[PDB]
Design a protein around this ligand. Structure first.
Ligand code: HEM
Ligand code: HEM
Lengths: 190, 190
């Protein structure tokens, strides 16, 4: 997957497993959510293209969101969209499958850097807008969470299991966006 | 309500109704959510003390969260807890009742400033820790959202209405925390 460097950034994040413990406590994530996020993995695995299609459509129908993938001339950069899509697809699986350990934290730092002006547009060597305003990363917790639900409700698992999968996904999405604030936030205020 | 200055800050926020339109779009909030957040108001009104008790208990059982209300000596500042509780109670009602207009935005800027080192501890004239790390404002989207649900499910409204109220509350909580990032985020990156 071009540009996907999970587990091989060779850069230790500015947050560690104690930070992660305290953040999991604040978002109410426990060993129960680890179980159910993993169960979500098998449910979502074969639906990733339809999830991606849904999320492409939401972004594509909103000029002020599609903006973040545009070339200077205001048109979508199709190379950029396609390359990011492959890494986004993998992130769906990673969120369910990966242990949230230091390597995971090190990639969460990398993902935040790539939304921020620090590293945006470098992974794919594209010319596009410099920064994704942080307000929209927070806002996206809702669509990224909520639009997962109908996919979770498909694979013939019990509705009770679906709800536990869904709550685990809400917590995990929130946890990640909290970490991705790091490069955006004034030093010492995170 | 001591320290509550909604509609009378006399300070225009650095975000306006166009910013709010675009943020509502990103969080999927529409006129339908305005209807259902308002309906939540009547449901939650008479339960605010029990909601507050629940949320006091969550914070109080976690030393690293109770930390934000502590005096220098590490003990909770009881004056500070009590005064903030009254403003938090009012915020529950405001979220349901208030029109999200410029006055509302101007108070969202104020609330963000009060979590941030810019204004924390000034409203109540207390000595406490300087800043609430932004990572925890994001993380709290989950408990502030999720722990509302059982309260919404009480007042004998239909479960379908409860779900719409709950989704409106999730969106509104997310929208607000996105705005409260403003004083935390490096200038030009919000
Ligand atoms: C809950 C919030 C969000 C999630 C979970 C999310 C997830 C992701 C993931 C997994 C990637 C690829 C990371 C990698 O390189 O391995 C990515 C990249 C990207 N996302 Fe987001 N995203 C979020 C918010 C946003 C928003 C609000 C936008 C605005 C359209 C956006 C636009 C982009 C762009 C343009 C890239 C490529 C950045 C680069 O140049 O490297 N994302 N996102
Ligand atoms: C979804 C996230 C949060 C929401 C909705 C929320 C809501 C509120 C509200 C409504 C107030 C009073 C605002 C006013 O002055 O009128 C407040 C103040 C305060 N909150 Fe939060 N809060 C959030 C996150 C946090 C976190 C993570 C902490 C950590 C314990 C926290 C601790 C405090 C403190 C210490 C104050 C008083 C700040 C000051 O000195 O003025 N809040 N919060």
């Amino acid at each position: 997957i071009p540009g996907y460097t999970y587990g091989e950034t060779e850069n230790r994040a500015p947050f560690n497993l104690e930070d992660l413990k305290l953040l999991k406590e604040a978002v109410m994530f426990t060993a129960e959510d680890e179980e159910y996020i993993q169960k979500a993995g098998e449910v979502l695995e074969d639906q990733v293209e339809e999830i991606l299609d849904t999320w492409a459509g939401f972004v594509g129908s909103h000029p002020h969101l599609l903006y973040y993938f545009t070339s200077p001339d205001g048109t979508p950069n199709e190379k950029y969209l396609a390359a990011v899509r492959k890494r986004f697809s993998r992130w769906i699986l990673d969120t369910s499958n990966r242990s949230y350990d230091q390597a995971w934290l090190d990639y969460q730092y990398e993902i935040g850097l790539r939304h921020h002006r620090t590293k945006k547009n470098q992974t794919d060597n594209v010319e596009s807008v410099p920064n994704i305003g942080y307000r929209y990363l927070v806002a996206f917790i809702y669509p990224i969470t909520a639009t997962m639900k109908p996919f979770l409700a498909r694979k013939g698992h019990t509705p009770e299991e679906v709800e536990k999968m869904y709550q685990a996904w809400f917590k995990a999405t929130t946890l990640q966006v909290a970490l991705w604030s790091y490069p955006y936030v004034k030093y010492g205020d995170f």
